[PDB]
Curated annotation (Swiss-Prot):
Protein name, UniProt field: Carbonic anhydrase 2
EC number, as in UniProt: 4.2.1.1, 4.2.1.69
GO cellular component, one term: cytoplasm
Lineage: Eukaryota, Metazoa, Chordata, Craniata, Vertebrata
UniProt-reported outcome of changing residue 116 to D/N/Q: Reduced activity
Phenotype when changing residue 64 to H: Enhanced proton transfer
Matching Gene3D superfamilies: Alpha carbonic anhydrase (3.10.200.10)
PANTHER family in alphabetical order: CARBONIC ANHYDRASE, CARBONIC ANHYDRASE 2
Reactions catalysed, as given in the entry: hydrogencarbonate + H(+) = CO2 + H2O; urea = cyanamide + H2O
Impact noted for substituting residue 195 to A/C/H/P: Strongly reduced activity
Amino acid sequence: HWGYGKHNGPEHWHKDFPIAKGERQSPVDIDTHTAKYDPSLKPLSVSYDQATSLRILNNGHAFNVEFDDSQDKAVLKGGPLDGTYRLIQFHFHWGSLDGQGSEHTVDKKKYAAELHLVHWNTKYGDFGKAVQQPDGLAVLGIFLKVGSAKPGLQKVVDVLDSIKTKGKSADFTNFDPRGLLPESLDYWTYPGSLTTPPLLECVTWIVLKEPISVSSEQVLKFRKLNFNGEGEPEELMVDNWRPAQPLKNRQIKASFK
Ligand SMILES: CCN[C@H]1CN(CCCOC)S(=O)(=O)c2sc(S(N)(=O)=O)cc21
Ligand SMILES: [Zn+2]
């Protein structure tokens, strides 16, 4: 089974999933000097005032927080999109030192971690049907750096010792995602895919320019988790990111001058 080690990491994935060498793969490096400003784009519209969270889980690859998507309650629209996209889950990727951790890079620079918020297009009915189409998903990414603490992240870090190993879950209600966003909403955008297998080419990426700050005691807690199951040898959950792939066919656009 796939993973991030010496014998089953990124350089091996193509043997079971051939699309790994396709024409619109992610992540990539963003060169700020080549990107072109586009004056016809529209501002982003984020409406999370009615969100209902349910549970938190460790899946062997990272940890995820889930929401109830049976009605329009937390949605994303505008920007380069046409239509309405509904929120289903969020997760993170990080490193073993403060100098590495993120998947996307800026003029060759790497940050300590990267946060991903996932949404699907309502015209298709539900989630499973949407991942099989070219314009099915929309993912919003935000960078993390080490400095002062972020108040709204604390409730997540205090529950981690109850889901240490693979297969564990716990109740997690009334959490508000508006507390993890920066001041400004200016961005970059291009067409791509998922960053872990099955690697399907169904995503419209939207990456924010301004990062958020967290303390060293907070990211320390992330590194104490495990990749293995209860009653098995200990392997620490660190360095779970895929590196930069070829641009080829595409061009990147910016909403700011
Ligand atoms: C471990 C498998 N992770 C996949 C599969 N997915 C199904 C998980 C059930 O949750 C609904 S997913 O479509 O949600 C999604 S989004 C991304 S990313 N890193 O944002 O590009 C990876 C994935
Ligand atoms: Zn991700």
